[PDB]
Assembly symmetry: C3
Homo-oligomer: 33 residues x 3
């Protein structure tokens, strides 16, 4: 279970960091977005 949680948490961390980047681009109008 723990090793399974660890793997899912790290997938979520990647996903969330990609979302933060995309959301900041939308919020700031980076590159016409």
């Amino acid at each position: 279970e723990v090793e399974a949680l660890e793997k899912k948490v790290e997938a979520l961390e990647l996903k969330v960091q990609k979302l933060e980047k995309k959301v900041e681009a939308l919020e700031h109008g980076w590159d016409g977005r």
Copy 2:
């Protein structure tokens, strides 16, 4: 603790998937967004 973590992780997974959908719609201008 582990069962508690498992439950919170799965809530985060739902949330993140809904955020990805919304962000992709904003990024692609789906349906006028």
Copy 3:
């Protein structure tokens, strides 16, 4: 490991809640966004 997971999960929860707020603002055009 468990205490480590707990800490990362709670960071993700903060992050996701901030993302939901920002995304809702973009989706609703709150405050010109």
